[PDB]
Design a protein around this ligand. Structure first.
Ligand SMILES: CCCCCCCCCCCCCCCCCC(=O)OC[C@H](COP(=O)([O-])OCC[N+](C)(C)C)OC(=O)CCCCCCCCCCCCCCCCC
Ligand SMILES: CCCCCCCCCCCCCCCCCC(=O)OC[C@H](COP(=O)([O-])OCC[N+](C)(C)C)OC(=O)CCCCCCCCCCCCCCCCC
Ligand SMILES: CCCCCCCCCCCCCCCCCC(=O)OC[C@H](COP(=O)(O)OCCN)OC(=O)CCCCCCCCCCCCCCCCC
Ligand SMILES: CCCCCCCCCCCCCCCCCC(=O)OC[C@H](COP(=O)(O)OCCN)OC(=O)CCCCCCCCCCCCCCCCC
Ligand SMILES: *C(=O)CCCCCCCCCCCCC
Lengths: 110, 87, 171, 70, 79, 65, 459, 177, 55, 62, 50, 128, 155, 122
């Protein structure tokens, strides 16, 4: 988790620095082609965070879920673990949608 | 990062934004044209103008200073004072 | 060097290296570089320093204390004999503390050395630690910050009275 | 172009104090470290030995380092 | 230092979603006077951005081609 | 030199950063396709799962009484 | 102990025969020389104490306190020479003379083998501090502070004199070396109950106990800087030394007569830390922090275990150094802005950066950042109180949280934020103030390398 | 509410402030530009419907119910500008805003690095200390008996003198020091 | 989760306005945990500090 | 003097630390306690020279 | 700091460690228990009669 | 309608929902003018003391000295022992002391009773 | 300074109330002292108990960080109502509703955790089998005794 | 997870408890049943320092895999055959455990049917 979380933070800092210290995703967008390297790194990091197969997160997170399913476990804890996994997917693509896709929303001078 | 500003660039950008307004004929406005009198605009038009200039320059003008910004020259002078240009 | 009987250690058994693959391991090359660049100059410098140390030789000794009578053969309120007995008891208290430290160091060394099979192979060290801790607890515990030989004598007398009563009621 | 003066508090006195502190520490720190190195290399530490029969040591002959014995 | 702004006649709201907002308001009976101000975000290099699936599939063509080449090379190398 | 800022327009791009981004995206997709072509088991399943309802009572030692 | 007493009384002709401009230089130089000389007391043995004569001895408990006193005197000479700049020369020499006399009484107090000689020196220490507070203090209520301090101490200490004379008549000697071997159990009765109260209340007042602490946020506040340093750093530890020496005669009645003061001091530190959270005065905040730490030492002495005693003596030395440094920093702020209000002068890190670093280090040692000796003492006391009972860990954890809270509140209020607009006399830090801060800091940081010389007589 | 030059807020000022707050919060709810444009025009139509109302009690009740409507439908966290109060970079550079009176405590060794700047500083200070008595004499005769009524300051009436109380609002630190 | 949030973003893109629900205000305002705790616990502790201990 | 960082910051501290560990830390007992090496069947001990016997035959299933 | 660093065996700790090593070796060689539960000999102690 | 905003101690009523804000009566206008006059007079005093070129020190604020003297040196002259003060003092002064005393006494009695029967595991406890 | 600018005792007559209101620089109608219950407040004014966060941030305060003016009467708990401490700004949701919603969420989560602890999940498998009497000697049992033999058969 | 519903929503007389299993003799219905065979010696697992939860009935494949891992350095992808063999024998042991659970379930069902018949006559 250290690798892709640190690099997600670094790419978010790059987006913040390029838009004059703006940390709001409501004032972003259209950065898929304007900043291609940070876009590529953000997509790779969100895919590794969500648990895309054969990335870095696949080798730890899926084994955690596989061991949690086939064990003498609290039922409710397993249920909220699965729901939280779905929510991680949801906010990852929320970040990707509101920060890269669409039309620009940042101030006029670029 | 953070390119500098000048009065010429500030005036050009503020006149650009005011020129893209559909309620103002672009061949009539100038740097010292008034809003209520010389252009025939309501107070709501002034509020929307001030919000447009805030969105253009990326910083917020407070209301107690927004009510008194009535011609483009005062907007230029307010932005120049707030951002400390020509140093 | 130290004494290998007070601090025991089993003989080291290392396996032979078997290079199944043809890829050269970097550890052998790094060990060669370490012996060439690091071990040789440090060894030469230590040789020079030891040569300087061998020119003049002087010795320091371990202090020996003869046994004096203990607090059991001291008259009450006799400050000379009680003073000597108290000093002797305090010295033995310090030595007993360091004995418990030695056994604890033995236990920690066994636990680290035996690896994952430490629960089976460190039975003797655990038994020695348990015995020496029981002896230390029965000798010196619950005395307070103002411990003295009289307090320890009173504690031992109370424990002996309890043991005698227990063996009388079980007879 | 366009260099502006940066107003900052007077940093002269703080740097002067730090330089004085470093100089006055090192003025005896360097000779003491050199002397300790020369004591360790050339004089060296003592070697543990059993007491000869009939011989009583002085009270300073029970310590290892030369400086502690001194 | 001195920077030159582009022309202002070129910001026309036609072909953009602002034209759809214009016709919706015209059906209601209203107007947006600031529509030409926002018209830059919908034209030029900022037009026709990719979708989400196209964003995740960036560089899939060259990756797939390299995978096919490498698999064929491994197929030939084992013989 | 550096990048000149643009007003109200798409910003200037270096060819180097576009090449680097495309190369790393292609590397990621090549790696995923390669590891799925080779392993395909850490995602799909390693061993068959036997249903216990199909086991005969003889091999489980069930006495008919 | 005459090799330290005689140079101390020879400091008096040195300050009374110096020039009009060379009194500070001479006194500071020769006091630093005697402070260097004081290291010869570290000839301690694992079984026997260092017994010099019939009247004087020094074991491993009194030695750190002695070294702290003899090191603290030149710090007070360096600190107190700016606000006495315009004073008359004879009054300046009288001030230095009272400091010298106080140091003489303090070094004769920690080495007294007889208990009545310890009492006589321990109450001879009252006069120079009362004179310093009530003469060179700056405020109106310095007289009221002196009255409160004097009468709390004397009302606590007269039954101690009566009880010590009773012990002399009953046992036959007040020599501490004799009483270690001639001690007897003290049974449960009303007579022995009032014996325990009489022998303990003087040091409970001087430490102070919660409820008897009302003289401290007055004497610590209306005093000058040198007075505040010697009150926080040494004078609170006379009570700790007294309870460490006198608990030997009070057994086994301590095990149930110590319950009410254990409850007073366990709950008292929470109350004083909470008071520290809402203080408008910086000096009062430091004084109440001193009350909380001395409550910790009171609990450690009262539960009477080896770990508690080692933690108590280490915490005493560490709190003395830390409180002295904090009072010095607050005094520097007072000299700059001429007010003790904490909210007045803000944002001084933008103006005084190295002083802000000194403030940060003092605050970090106040909240017991490991491996400082503050944390060593506090940790050992926490372990021993956990051995006493388990809910003491709840009380100690709450105290640690509030301690970190008010220390960082001090630091954030004074140093951080936006600076005060209308204050424009913030001069740069002198070399004297920085040297004073470093002479408080560097021994405190160096003692973490060899912490075994401050761990009491049962290390 | 809290105004330097006025004791109250007029009705029109309240309406304009409500209009700006409602449009900002509607922009926060409607993050896309075209959607915000459409709903801003709807809000502008709603505000223009009751523009010509002469009943003061009815206009007051309309304003009160509009404020209730805004409070029911505000964003939980609206968009704040980075330098606006409550922003992410609000009062960030206050640690670097060293006041100008700290230059008088500089050592002469480090004052020699900027000779012309310190010469200009000296002539600025000479001008300030020359103009102070004139400006306080101007301010003394312009304040009515009973104290000033508002916080507005007068300008310089004649030629040569500077406006009263000018030093600490001219020599204030830059936004990015 | 990916499908659900893609549909959520597509519905966000529409030209409709809806008032916020209690679930949205619960999720956006961090579950009301800091707004309650950081206003309640310091209030009680500081009032106990001044009204009870200090005064 | 191009590569003084690999000399002043690595080689000199490596020399000092190796000296300190060889002649002052490994002299005292139980200072560097190292886990004994893992031994498998079929290995050969350096010190004794013995050969550890191989394990039993496998009852093959695959 | 130099004086404190080279203190001659402060409070006999190193001597205690050396003597503990000697005593542990001597007691381990002869099969003796390393420490007994009683500090003083029970033979030279007269318990009160009850 | 809309749910009415109920104010609390830790969440004040907003200034745009206050019914007394929209008051236009002449008494409130006179009050606001008087408050503005007081504020402007105090600001004039402060700025006169603030912009003086010949001043190098602290512009003393009598309000801050008043606040500190009220917080510190007025509490006992303005204290009268009555039912409320004595009740609060007995609740907050001897309440927690008695509670903690009984808690610690019960715990130590239980521990000391368990120790003397040999029911408490003290096998490796030699540090105290 | 003088002794007639410092705070005093509780005012009884309207004359001393007006004098105190003039002393603290506030109008007589807006000046309310604390109630005279003997707590020790004196005649210090009872200001409306609002944090400094509720002040106007765009006003030019004499003290900008504290949002405080020179000469203005200072609140009794100003060191508690600073921007670093307790906030009293209005919330988008009513305080009671946030309290009940948070408490209900925490209680429901605790109840369902208890229910899931009562009825756990598992897999249709038997116990794991280990050789050598369930690893008796490896688990620390002494070898001089002999354990009860744990025998695992095939299936 | 149908057995979860059959035990909780259904009845607990048929579904066996996992915490106490098996509740039947191993000779019940199994004539001349043999034991499992341990290949790895106690000393062989002891000196290879396997984890105590890792010393199950198939540790010989684990020892072979560990030797293959040690001898193939630095080729960390060198041998997956020993890992696959160990994993397959793990799968076989898991199948054995599933067989034991199903056997216990069927025995409990048979006993329930026997008591139901016994109630049907008596
Ligand atoms: C700072 C304020 C608080 C200060 C608190 C000070 C301590 C409180 C208790 C002090 C008691 C007085 C000294 C007792 C010394 C006892 C020595 C001794 O031998 O005791 C055994 C002796 C026993 O008598 P005896 O020893 O002669 O007899 C032989 C022994 N028997 C009895 C067995 C035959 O005790 C006494 O003689 C009486 C002791 C109790 C005295 C009660 C009166 C004083 C009450 C408290 C006053 C506290 C200060 C008040 C003023 C405060 C300021 C305004
Ligand atoms: C003492 C009671 C009174 C207290 C107040 C006293 C005031 C007056 C002051 C008088 C002088 C000072 C007296 C106390 C001196 C204490 C210091 C002392 O002597 O220590 C002896 C100790 C003695 O150590 P030792 O005991 O281990 O040495 C063995 C003994 N000999 C030397 C005989 C073999 O000295 C040291 O520990 C020095 C070790 C080497 C130097 C430090 C190396 C490491 C430094 C840090 C490296 C980086 C780490 C990571 C950092 C990360 C960023 C933060
Ligand atoms: C990994 C396997 C990826 C391929 C199989 C799964 C595909 C999938 O989930 O598709 C759902 C969806 C795309 O489908 P849809 O939204 O209907 O179409 C968009 C317009 N082309 O959404 C996506 O495909 C995007 C999310 C894919 C996430 C994959 C990694 C987790
Ligand atoms: C105010 C400021 C803040 C606080 C500062 C410190 C103030 C408190 C200091 C003194 C505290 C009280 C003294 C210590 C009491 C310890 C417990 C104890 O022993 O109580 C005595 C007694 C206990 O009962 P019992 O054991 O039967 O007594 C027979 C003894 N032979 O108890 C009883 O029988 C009940 C009480 C009877 C009256 C006792 C009067 C004498 C003690 C107080 C003087
Ligand atoms: C019986 O159901 C055995 C399986 C374990 C208990 C139920 C687990 C339910 C959650 C996992 C499946 C989720 C499918 C999307």
């Amino acid at each position: 988790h250290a690798f892709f979380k640190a690099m997600l933070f670094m790419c978010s800092g790059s987006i913040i620095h390029s838009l004059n210290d703006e940390q709001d995703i409501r004032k972003m967008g259209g950065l898929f082609k304007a900043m291609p390297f940070t876009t590529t790194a953000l997509i790779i990091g969100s895919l590794a965070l969500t648990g895309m197969p054969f990335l870095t997160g696949f080798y730890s997170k899926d084994l955690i879920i596989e061991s949690a399913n086939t064990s003498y476990t609290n039922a409710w804890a397993l249920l909220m673990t699965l729901v939280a996994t779905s929510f991680t997917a949801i906010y990852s693509t929320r970040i990707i949608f509101f920060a890269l896709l669409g039309q620009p929303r940042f101030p006029t001078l670029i | 990062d953070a390119p500098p500003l000048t009065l010429e660039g500030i005036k050009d950008r503020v006149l650009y934004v005011l020129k893209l307004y559909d309620k103002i004929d672009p061949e009539k406005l100038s740097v010292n044209s008034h809003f209520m009198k010389d252009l025939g605009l309501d107070s709501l038009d002034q509020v929307e103008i001030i919000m447009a200039m805030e969105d253009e320059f990326g910083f917020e003008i407070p209301d107690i200073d927004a009510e008194k910004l009535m011609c483009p020259q005062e907007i230029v002078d307010y932005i120049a004072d707030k951002k400390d240009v020509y140093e | 060097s130290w004494d290998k009987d007070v601090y025991p250690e089993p003989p080291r058994r290392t396996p032979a290296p078997s290079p199944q693959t043809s890829l050269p391991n970097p550890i052998t090359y790094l060990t060669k570089a370490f012996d060439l660049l690091v071990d040789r100059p440090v060894t030469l410098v230590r040789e020079f320093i030891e040569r300087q140390h061998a020119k003049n030789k002087y010795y320091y000794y371990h202090r020996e204390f003869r046994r004096v009578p203990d607090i059991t053969e001291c008259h009450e309120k006799d400050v000379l004999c009680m003073f000597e007995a108290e000093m002797q008891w305090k010295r033995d208290y310090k030595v007993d503390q360091e004995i418990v430290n030695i056994i604890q160091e033995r236990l920690k060394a066994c636990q680290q050395r035996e690896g994952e099979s430490h629960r089976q192979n460190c039975a003797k060290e655990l038994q020695q630690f348990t015995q020496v801790v029981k002896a230390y607890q029965d000798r010196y515990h619950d005395l307070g910050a103002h411990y003295s030989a009289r307090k320890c004598l009173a504690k031992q007398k109370q424990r002996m009275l309890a043991e005698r009563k227990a063996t009388k009621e079980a007879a | 172009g366009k260099r502006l003066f940066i107003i900052k508090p007077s940093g002269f006195y703080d740097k002067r104090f730090l330089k004085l502190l470093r100089f006055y520490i090192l003025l005896t720190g360097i000779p003491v470290v050199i002397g300790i190195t020369l004591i360790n290399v050339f004089i060296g530490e003592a070697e543990l030995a059993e007491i000869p029969e009939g011989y009583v040591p002085e009270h300073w002959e029970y310590f290892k380092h030369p400086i502690s014995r001194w | 230092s001195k920077m030159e702004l582009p022309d202002y006649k070129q910001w026309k709201i036609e072909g953009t979603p602002l034209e759809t907002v214009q016709e919706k308001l015209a059906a209601r009976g209203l107007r947006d006077p600031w529509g030409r101000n926002e018209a830059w975000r919908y034209m030029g290099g900022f037009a026709n951005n990719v979708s989400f699936v196209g964003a995740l599939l960036k560089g899939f063509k060259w990756g797939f081609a390299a995978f096919v080449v490498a698999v064929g090379a491994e197929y030939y190398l084992e013989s | 030199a550096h990048i000149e800022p643009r007003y109200r327009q798409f910003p200037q791009l270096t060819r180097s950063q576009v090449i680097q981004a495309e190369f790393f995206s292609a590397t990621m997709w090549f790696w995923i396709l390669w590891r799925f072509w080779h392993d395909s088991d850490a995602v799909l399943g390693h061993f068959p799962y036997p249903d216990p309802s199909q086991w005969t009572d003889e091999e489980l030692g069930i006495p008919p009484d | 102990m005459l090799k330290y007493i005689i140079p101390t009384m020879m400091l008096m002709p040195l300050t009374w025969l110096s020039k009009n401009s060379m009194i500070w230089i001479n006194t500071t130089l020769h006091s630093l020389l005697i402070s260097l000389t004081s290291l010869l007391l570290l000839n301690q043995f694992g079984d026997n104490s260092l017994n010099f004569s019939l009247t004087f001895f020094s074991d491993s408990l009194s030695t750190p306190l002695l070294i702290l006193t003899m090191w603290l005197l030149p710090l007070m000479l360096m600190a107190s020479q700016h606000h006495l700049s315009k004073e008359n020369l004879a009054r300046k020499k009288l001030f230095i003379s009272m400091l010298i006399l106080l140091q003489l009484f303090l070094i004769m107090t920690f080495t007294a083998t007889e208990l009545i000689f310890f009492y006589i020196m321990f109450e001879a220490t009252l006069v120079p501090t009362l004179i310093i507070i009530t003469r060179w203090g700056n405020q109106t209520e310095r007289l009221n502070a002196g009255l409160y301090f004097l009468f709390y101490t004397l009302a606590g200490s007269l039954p101690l004199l009566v009880a010590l004379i009773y012990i002399q008549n009953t046992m036959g000697s007040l020599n501490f070396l004799i009483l270690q071997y001639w001690v007897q159990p003290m049974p449960n009765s009303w007579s022995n109950t009032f014996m325990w109260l009489a022998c303990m209340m003087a040091f409970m007042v001087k430490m102070p106990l919660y409820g008897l602490h009302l003289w401290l946020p007055k004497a610590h506040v209306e005093a000058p800087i040198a007075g505040s340093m010697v009150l926080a750093a040494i004078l609170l530890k006379l009570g700790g030394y007294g309870m460490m020496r006198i608990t030997l005669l009070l057994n086994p009645i301590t095990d149930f007569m110590a319950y009410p003061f254990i409850m007073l001091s366990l709950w008292g530190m929470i109350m004083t830390s909470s008071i520290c959270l809402r203080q408008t005065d910086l000096k009062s905040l430091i004084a109440y922090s001193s009350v909380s730490h001395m409550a910790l030492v009171i609990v450690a002495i009262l539960i009477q275990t080896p770990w508690s005693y080692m933690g108590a003596t280490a915490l005493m030395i560490a709190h003395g150094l830390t409180s002295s440094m904090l009072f010095c920093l607050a005094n520097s702020n007072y000299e700059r802005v001429h007010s003790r209000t904490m909210i007045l002068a803000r944002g001084l890190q933008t103006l005084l950066p190295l002083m802000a670093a000194w403030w940060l280090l003092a605050s970090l040692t106040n909240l017991a950042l490991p491996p400082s000796i503050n944390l060593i003492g506090e940790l050992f006391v926490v372990m021993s109180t956990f051995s006493w009972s388990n809910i003491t860990i709840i009380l100690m954890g709450l105290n640690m949280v509030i301690t970190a809270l008010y220390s960082l509140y001090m630091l954030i209020t004074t140093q951080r934020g936006k600076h005060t607009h209308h204050i424009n006399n913030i001069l740069p830090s002198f070399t004297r103030e920085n040297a004073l801060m470093s002479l408080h800091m560097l021994p405190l940081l160096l003692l973490s390398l060899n912490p075994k010389i401050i761990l009491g007589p049962l290390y | 509410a809290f105004l330097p030059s006025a004791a109250y807020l007029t009705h029109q000022q309240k309406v304009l402030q409500l209009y700006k707050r409602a449009l900002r919060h509607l922009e926060s709810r409607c993050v896309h530009r075209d959607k915000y444009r459409y709903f801003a025009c709807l809000l502008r139509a709603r505000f223009d419907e009751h523009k010509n109302e002469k009943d003061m009690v009815k206009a007051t009740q309309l304003l009160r119910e509009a404020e209730k409507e805004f409070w029911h439908g505000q964003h939980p966290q609206p968009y704040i500008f980075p330098e606006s109060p409550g922003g992410t970079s609000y009062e960030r550079y206050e640690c670097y805003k060293v006041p100008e009176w700290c230059l008088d405590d500089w050592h002469p060794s480090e004052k020699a690095m900027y000779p012309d700047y310190f010469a200009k500083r000296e002539q600025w200070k000479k001008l300030r200390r020359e103009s102070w008595e004139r400006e306080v004499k101007q301010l003394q005769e312009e304040t009515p008996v009973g104290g000033p009524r508002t916080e507005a300051l007068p300008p310089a009436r004649k030629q040569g003198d500077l406006p009263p109380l000018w030093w600490h609002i001219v020599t204030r630190p830059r936004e990015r020091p | 989760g990916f499908i659900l949030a893609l549909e959520i973003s597509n519905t966000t893109h529409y030209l409709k306005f809806n008032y916020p629900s209690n679930t949205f205000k619960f999720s956006n305002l961090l579950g009301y945990y800091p707004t309650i705790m950081h206003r309640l616990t310091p209030y009680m502790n500081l009032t106990m500090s001044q009204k009870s201990a200090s005064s | 003097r191009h590569s003084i960082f690999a000399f002043t910051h690595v080689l000199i501290p490596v020399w000092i630390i190796h000296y300190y560990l060889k002649y002052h830390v490994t002299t005292k007992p139980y200072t560097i306690v190292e886990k004994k090496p893992r031994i498998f069947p079929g290995d050969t001990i350096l010190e004794t020279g013995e050969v550890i016997p191989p394990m039993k035959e496998f009852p093959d299933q695959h | 700091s130099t004086f404190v660093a080279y203190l001659p065996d402060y409070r006999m700790q190193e001597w205690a460690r050396r003597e503990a090593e000697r005593l542990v070796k001597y007691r381990e060689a002869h099969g003796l228990p390393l420490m007994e539960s009683n500090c003083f000999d029970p033979s030279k102690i007269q318990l009160p009669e009850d | 309608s809309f749910p009415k905003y109920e104010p609390s101690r830790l969440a004040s009523l907003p200034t745009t929902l206050d019914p007394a804000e929209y008051d236009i009566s002449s008494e409130t206008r006179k009050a606001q003018a008087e408050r503005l006059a007081i504020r402007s007079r105090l600001k004039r005093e402060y700025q006169l003391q603030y912009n003086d070129p010949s001043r190098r020190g602290v512009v003393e604020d009598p309000a801050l000295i008043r606040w500190t003297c009220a917080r510190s040196a007025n509490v006992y002259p303005n204290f009268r022992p009555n039912t409320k003060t004595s009740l609060l003092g007995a609740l907050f002064g001897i309440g927690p002391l008695i509670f903690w005393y009984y808690v610690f006494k019960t715990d130590r009695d239980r521990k000391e009773k368990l120790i003397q029967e040999g029911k408490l595991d003290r096998t490796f406890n030699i540090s105290y | 300074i003088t002794k007639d600018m410092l705070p005093g005792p509780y005012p009884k007559t309207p004359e001393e109330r007006a004098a105190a209101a003039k002393k603290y620089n506030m109008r007589v109608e807006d000046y309310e002292p604390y109630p005279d219950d003997g707590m020790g407040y004196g005649d210090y004014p009872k200001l409306p108990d609002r944090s400094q966060q509720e002040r106007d941030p765009w006003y030019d305060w004499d003290h900008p960080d504290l949002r405080l003016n020179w000469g203005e009467p200072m609140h009794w708990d100003l060191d508690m109502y600073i921007r670093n401490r307790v906030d009293t700004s209005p919330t988008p949701v009513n305080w009671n509703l946030m309290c009940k919603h948070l408490f209900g969420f925490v209680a429901f989560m605790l109840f369902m955790f208890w229910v899931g602890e009562t009825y756990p999940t598992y897999q249709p498998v038997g116990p794991k089998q280990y050789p050598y009497n369930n690893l008796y000697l490896e688990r620390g049992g002494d070898p001089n005794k002999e354990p009860e033999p744990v025998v695992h058969y095939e299936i | 997870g149908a057995h979860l519903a059959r035990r909780y929503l259904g009845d607990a007389s048929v579904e066996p408890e996992p915490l106490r299993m098996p509740t039947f003799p191993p000779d019940y219905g199994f004539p001349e049943r043999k034991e499992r065979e341990m290949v790895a010696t106690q000393q062989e697992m002891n000196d290879a320092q396997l984890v105590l939860q890792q010393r199950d009935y198939c540790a010989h494949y684990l020892i072979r895999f560990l030797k293959c891992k040690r001898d193939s350095f630095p080729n960390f992808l060198a041998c997956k055959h020993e890992q696959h063999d160990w994993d397959y024998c793990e799968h076989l042991d898991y199948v054995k455990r599933m067989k034991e659970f199903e056997r216990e379930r069927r025995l409990l069902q048979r006993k329930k049917r026997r008591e139901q018949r016994e109630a049907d006559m008596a």
